[PDB]
Amino acid sequence: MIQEQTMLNVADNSGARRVMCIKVLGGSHRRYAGVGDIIKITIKEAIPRGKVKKGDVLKAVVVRTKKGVRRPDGSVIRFDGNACVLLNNNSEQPIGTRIFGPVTRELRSEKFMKIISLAPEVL
Amino acid sequence: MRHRKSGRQLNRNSSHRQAMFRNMAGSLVRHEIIKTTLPKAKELRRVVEPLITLAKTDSVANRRLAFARTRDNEIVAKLFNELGPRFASRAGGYTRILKCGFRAGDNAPMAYIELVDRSEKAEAA
């Protein structure tokens, strides 16, 4: 359940450490972002020589949330923190080359295919 | 709303309501019959009637349990010693509510609440 001002940890090697969600994309008045929804982010904390720098405005796919995903049987999967993966502004593809932490099978879609392969664990 | 909620507030907070029902459940056990307002009378049944269900089995635990519920050894005595074995056979409903009139100074609808099988000899002395 990500919104404007929600801070997220980064689940990749894009160089960003802390990003803030500045807009929930995908429709007028759209309130929240969930696992697999695209957000517009601003970098607040970044590593010295990574692919991205502090202040850079770009996109991101949410991969883990504290609210988590539901399954057809009612089964929930909750994560301890909200984390996203950085995306190229126009290409909507991963900026990093490596994915850290577990991700859900919800991601399995053609545009997030890269993320589930690289991913260490898929729930 | 109030959907399926049980228990009157009687314009009192939790601690007060509790202590009032502890004293009242005492007064009934002692005098075997008391006069009170009908809503209080009807609620008193939910307090006193299970105290007797306890008193049906004499035990150190049950006695302490009823003690923590009454806070009067005189009452816990009368329960386990008398009433328990008096209502030994009876499957609930140890009290009776008789609607009487209306109180003067405030027009409250009154009632008597008595122990089903009353002892006029324990009530006077």
Binding site: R64, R71, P72, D73, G74, S75, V76, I77, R78, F79, D80, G81, F100, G101, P102, R105, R108, P120, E121, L123 | -
Partner: protein, 114 residues
């Protein structure tokens, strides 16, 4: 309520092993790995049990790649294949929600030898 209990027990599992909070369970679950149907394991501490007949559930916490991951299993779901107690846990409380703020060494649960 009488009809409902009738509809529920006919859908209810009979083989559920006994586990309680603290116990470390290994839930074998049915999943579709793209174009395959296999069993995946989820071995973690049982931090909560909801007993509700058909509606019975339980919460299993694991620390996958530094981060905590809880899963809420609906016990009578066909998804859930097997449940297996890997270690018998020793705790007092029925909900180990305090554990969510404990890490590694603080989060350890004693073995229940009995």
């Amino acid at each position: 309520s009488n009809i409902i209990k009738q509809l529920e027990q006919e859908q209810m599992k009979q083989d559920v092993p006994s586990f309680r909070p603290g116990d470390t369970v290994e839930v074998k679950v049915w999943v579709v790995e793209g174009s395959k149907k296999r069993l995946q394991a989820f071995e973690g501490v049982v931090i909560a049990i909801r007993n509700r007949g058909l509606h019975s559930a339980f919460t299993v916490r694991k620390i996958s790649n530094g981060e905590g991951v809880e899963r809420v299993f609906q016990t009578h779901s066909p998804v859930v294949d097997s449940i297996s107690v890997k270690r018998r846990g020793a705790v007092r409380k029925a909900k180990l929600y305090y554990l969510r703020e404990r890490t590694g060494k603080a989060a350890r649960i004693k073995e229940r030898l009995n």
